[model samples]
Target chain A: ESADLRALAKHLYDSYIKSFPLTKAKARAILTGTTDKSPFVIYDMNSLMMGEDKIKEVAIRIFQGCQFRSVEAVQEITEYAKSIPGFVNLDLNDQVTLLKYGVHEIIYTMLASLMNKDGVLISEGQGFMTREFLKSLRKPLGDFMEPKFEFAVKFNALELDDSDLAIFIAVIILSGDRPGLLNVKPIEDIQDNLLQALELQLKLNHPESSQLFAKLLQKMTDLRQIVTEHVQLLQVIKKTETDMSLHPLLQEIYKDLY
Target chain B: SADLRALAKHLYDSYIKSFPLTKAKARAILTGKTTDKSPFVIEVAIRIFQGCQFRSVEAVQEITEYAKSIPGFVNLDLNDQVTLLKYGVHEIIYTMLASLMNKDGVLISEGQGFMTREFLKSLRKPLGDFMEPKFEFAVKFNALELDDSDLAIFIAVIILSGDRPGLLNVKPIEDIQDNLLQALELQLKLNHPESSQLFAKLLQKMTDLRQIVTEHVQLLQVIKKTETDMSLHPLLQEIYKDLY
Candidate 1:
């Protein structure tokens, strides 16, 4: 019964490139922060007067990039969530809550899939950011990269393919034990069935690695940890960048998360 | 909050101190017998069974005590308390198991003994299968090398998880979990000042613990399928059957 859901998840992931098109060149552009000659750079100036306008430009560009990535994450998770059998049946409020709490986690999980030993692919194979470059982001923004990179590096070690990742993401979305949920049992049931399917499929696929399924399950928690950090970073951005136009849905989700 | 922290520390210390094991002489007696029937393997299997039972009971007792010490844990309806414990025990036990474990095997009894991963893997069918993933998780989890302060609150978070399906008083349990999460984050910040990702890393470990337990439960269900003439204890069997 749940085998179909697993297939659906894989289908969604396989077709992800159709919309996002995060090819090597595009990912490299995203990591570089611009396709134009100038890269997105953060300058450390103790004195505000030195390059205030430049700093503002950098912050705006960074915020824009961050928002774009988050929106993409939400879109992908939304499409995936809607395809799951019982997801849309969840209360609208509950659905939003799950998305709000869950989108970033799932985003990072996918991002981990795109990551290699060096760092995450910004554009497919061509655009890669060294771990050091990500760590050098100014202040609270830099804070976001470390935890995620830390999580991704370890998660990528498990080496789950798109099919495995698809089942895992469905489990994350349907496992809505999130607060303010109206229908827990149905969602949990769906999650349990999917989990069973994932376990069986993972065993069948990766016969040698006895711990792979368990390791993947553990990554769900790791996903939460990264999302927690992501939320914290978003909160900081919201407070400091009052002029930044945060997405309404993301804003609503963040407001409820705290 | 301070009271809760102190209680968490105390419960953790008590748990580590009371863990079970056997002396070399006793282990020798248990393993000394060898016949064509392979009494040694059977003896080791029985001892492993006993060890698992003892660990499960000891863990539940510690968690029950720790939960009671949470200011209003007793104030929740009796049924809610049982529900919370019922769903939450395996997670707590496995989290502790991870904390107690090393690359080789877990400390089945502190100082007195260790259960090598290979030895556990050498046991009979269901027994070997049951302990395999746990030892795997424990070995990987031990690589994190969390300190006791961090581990104490991490275990509390596992115990007080608000999302454990059937809780009647979800609000209070959620409230307790929030407090513990904050406390754990704060302790991690203070303890590892240089490590920026400590809290997130610990939180990931909690998620890993959940995954491990889920797999454990699933493995148990798989074991239950071939029960022709096994002498599994009622308490352990009940745990596997009841928990998700």
Candidate 2:
């Protein structure tokens, strides 16, 4: 919640003196300064993006007081937000937006059912990827959306691979063992529930919704590669031909793997 | 007209014989408006008021309209002036001016007695001053002869009790005394056909009121002096030293 665009920017800066994340020291160092720590890198990357997009404005005066970088990054974050309605109203750094970019095209069609409040329409299938892909099918051949149904009634939806699990996976891979870092536990602890969360997202979200689950899945796939690449880049910066220091965030991810 | 007036008076005497003084007179005064020589004056008169027939708001309205046309010793304001004339004629039909009509024929039409229109206008300069342009009931009540209608008397008493109009109830003490005189006049007029003794009684009541007001003023002065003297008390020396 502190990561919410408003709280993350302000008052949260002040609240820091009263309390801090359990991994405050490392989180502060990596996020505020140049470091190969993945979580901090991610936080910094988000701050840079926020600055570029103008979603939230940063105040230069408090820059040194708080650990996160780029306090005056609002208008830039909002610049990206121009494309998404109501996106500005959302809490900062809510991970939901990443899912929206995944299956962008298919999800757009389901907007009516999401906004109508009177009715819900859905197709059933297995796995996050396949269920999302069900929308990729054209409606039954003779119905309203008939001409668009390229695969007609017979098309089966697709399933996601490990590649599709990228967004959440990146969270663990770059956790940096800090509280700012995403925590990845045993898959059994949260895997089913996370999948259920995806399912619920699909059920609740309309195809027209900017954040339909399938769109999220597709984006998540791309996001993983982006994060993985970011992690590698951080590693590159920290390492030389003769010397290697595990970056803090990436070091946490390595611990998980080991 | 004299016979009619005598008959109307008989009818009123019968009605008041059983009713309580205030309520009966409130109604009785309506009946006695023209014929009665008593100082008991009821300003809110209406034709068909048939003091005996007075029961509801509608009935009061009906009689009040009738009282408007009656010509006068004319103590009652507009509505009563009309209806007050109807008292002399038992069943005579009379036309009344509607412009002079009010919810009750009872109007205090003394034209804001003693208080100047300009001064009253100054009081209206506050927020929420909407009840302007009403007949000055207090003035009419104060100005009424003692023999006004019983209802008028009751209402007049009510008006004097608190509603005596002036700017912020700050009427000069003389004005209050004059109002008290009006109340005294009403008591003497209504006391009886031969209320010579009652007139003396009325004077006694007025004297009592004057005494009460005098004592009240003295009491205020003493309280003011006592407040001043307390600071001068020797106790202050000890208290001031301790406080500092």
Candidate 3:
């Protein structure tokens, strides 16, 4: 809404855009799949499926794959959060808490990268797994993953780039309205700036979908709801937990995610 | 999926099929004692305004009746229902009247008479100011050639909008609008299956429609400020002030 607001947004873009391994635009630029003949390493259901022990192990395997992949992503987005000018000055614990609470919603935005109608890229781009086959894995993970595909397909249609995604990620992290916080004013002020920044960014990046700016705001809201569903089903996944030893960092984040 | 088709049919029979702007009915209102008594464009502007003020009664009645009959519309607090119609009625009328224009002129008395855009523009400021964009949108909207079914759901969609002020029942209104919109998208897909982007483009018309109405509200406020003696029907007065 302001010129400096656009500057705040441009600062965010400069910080995080194209910093990730594969943004959705780059992924879509590759040979996206089709039914006549699909590509990407499609994970075979039989080969991937195992006895109950390894089934749980595979779920752990999937979780570890996620944690390892997210490490770089976590640091990248965290730097952007820190780059928000005054975020590091927040209450020491609250700084970590904001990142802790906000990462899942942030990740959903990035998950649109390397995703399509059929499925998503997992194992850090090692293979493509159909959401249908993943849905076969039972509760929490199955349907938990489905909505991302739904959200992703629609999000991908907006044709946003890493620059847009970075600003959006900034907004999600800086929103300042999440579960626990000692300081909300500064974060919300910066967030409001990023919101305007992101809005201005969309005007430059995807003007054809002029309505996309509002739709993307609506998408961010949808992402939060998706995270709620994800967090609520944590216990369902808790009944069958993941490998805690492989990623103790996520262990603390997962524990606090509740 | 065709159950949605039934909802579309229900919308058609229950609302738009009997829309007030049609041939015989429009003539009934426009053919009063003052009819064609004015020859100059300015005089004709008064004639048009008189026709419109009178026609507002028929349109609001048509709107409320349709609003009441549509499922879940009256489920809103009745006062909230009034607020919805308050904000929405004239905008709904715009879509209904959009068909009356053929770019150059607006056909009245169901096309028995036509008023050119230049003459319509001669409408004496405040009132005159509103038609340029109105005629603009009318010409643009007429290009789509929407049928009664789509327009019916669209009108309901407009009224049931959760964005209405003074709403105590916003969520219910949104849900109702959501279902109507789904039906709208499906109806459009069924009829215009060959056209890929029409649904999204059709949505833009709603946005454009709001822009035209926003200016209409601005012009109406101007008339109030000018203290010009243009009369408003009770329901029109209720919807006279609306959303940003």
Q: Judged by TM-score, which candidate is best? A: 3
TM-score of each: 0.41, 0.15, 0.43
Candidate 2 Cα errors over 4 Å, as ranges: A1-186, A207-211, A238-258, B1-244
Which model is ahead, 2 or 3, in terms of TM-score?
3
Specify the CAPRI tier of model 1: incorrect
Error of 3 at A31 (Å): 4.9
Superposition TM-score, candidate 2 onto the true structure: 0.15
Clashes of each: 8, 58, 1
lDDT of 2 by residue, A13-114 (tens): 333222212222332233233445323111232433433332221122111211121111111122222223232233222212222222222222111111
Distance from true position, residue B32, model 1, in Å?
99
Q: How far is A144's C-alpha from truth in model 2 (Å)?
A: 47
Per-residue lDDT of model 3, residues A1-258, tens digit only: 567877776677677754466656556655354343333454555656522232224554565456445444554555567677777777655665566656667777888887888877754454567777777774445666777788888888887877788787877777777766778888888787777788778787775775887888898789878767755555444333332222222232212211
Compute the lDDT of residue B154 as modeled in candidate 2. Answer: 28
lDDT by residue (A128-245, candidate 1, tens digit) is 4555555666665566666767787787666566567667777887765776678788888888878887887787678778688778878788777676666566655544542212
Q: Per-residue CA lDDT of candidate 2, range B1-244, in tens?
A: 3443333343334323322233223334334463443332231111111121122212223333223211122232322222222221111111011112122343112211122323333441221121123223222323323332332222222222222222233233234334434544444554555645554543443333334334433433343234221111122111112211
If the candidates were sorted by their TM-score against the true structure, best first, what order would they fall in? 3, 1, 2
The i-RMS of every model, in angstroms, reads 21.9, 45.0, 28.3
* Model 1's TM-score against the true structure: 0.41
The DockQ score of candidate 3 comes to: 0.01
Clashing pairs in 3: B86-B239
List the lowest-lDDT window of 10 residues for candidate 2 chain A: A120-129
State the lDDT at B195 in candidate 1. 77
